[PDB]
Design a protein around this ligand. Sequence first.
Ligand code: HEM
Ligand SMILES: Cc1cnc2ccccc2c1N
Length: 289
Amino acid sequence: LVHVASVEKGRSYEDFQKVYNAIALKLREDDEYDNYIGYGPVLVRLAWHISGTWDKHDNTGGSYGGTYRFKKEFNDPSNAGLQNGFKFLEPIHKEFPWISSGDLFSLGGVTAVQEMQGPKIPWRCGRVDTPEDTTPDNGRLPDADKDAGYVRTFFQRLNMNDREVVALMGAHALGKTHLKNSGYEGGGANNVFTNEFYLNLLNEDWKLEKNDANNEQWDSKSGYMMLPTDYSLIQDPKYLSIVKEYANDQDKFFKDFSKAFEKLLENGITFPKDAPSPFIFKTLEEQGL
Ligand code: HEM
Ligand SMILES: Cc1cnc2ccccc2c1N
């Protein structure tokens, strides 16, 4: 099963910079969402969930086909809460109806990372909408109540190794869990991309507690939380070494996250030899906007 990137007809960097800018300006504007967190973190999670359905074994799922727009995937219990991200992107799609759904969802995640002061994430266009019958079944996204071995095995299906997994998990610096979405609660309210997830893991005094949904999570008296799968990164000695590395080197974390996130958003896509190079979009701040 082959998905060949096909550039939206006649479009080039400047077109996609315009879409980036529209997303970024709306991120600035709609600042009240989720107790003033803003839409940045949910857009990152949306880009990951539309990509994280991929299966390397048969090339099903993945960001290419934009299948989150269909009911089966939109209604996946694992995706509860992401409708807010979809709704945010609706007026962007109405203004730029030529962009494919997979390109829009993945670009939303790139734009959010960068606008939240994260690393630059090179991004490639050319995902093409596929029909409703290509929508992956529910159950391909990961459970949070599990251990390091589960996490490691899970991510092999996405062709990610230990360093890639630990780097990607650093996105849990962003946003928060919501009891009604996932059965986990808390995590404060950060909307600036940093390596703080790793600092929090190593430096806080963690207690294993039950939340109001009767699920276990790790809590600190400072008011932070970690999912069982988050905490597994310091329980496993291979993951712990990498956590320590990222806790001690912001730039390395940024560079490794950028690579892993681009890879995640491109899994399953065949780029022709004569496709455009990846685009690196300027932030609003870089443009003086
Ligand atoms: C073992 C892997 C992972 C598990 C089990 C997991 C689980 C979760 C859970 C349960 C939530 C809370 C959802 C809610 O209540 O609203 C969440 C939020 C989030 N996840 Fe993950 N996640 C994983 C990996 C990732 C990855 C790889 C990324 C992106 C690179 C990511 C990005 C985020 C973001 C940004 C949020 C916050 C969303 C918000 O504030 O609305 N997650 N994740
Ligand atoms: C501090 C922390 C830890 N884990 C998280 C998992 C998902 C989303 C946000 C998180 C978060 N802010």
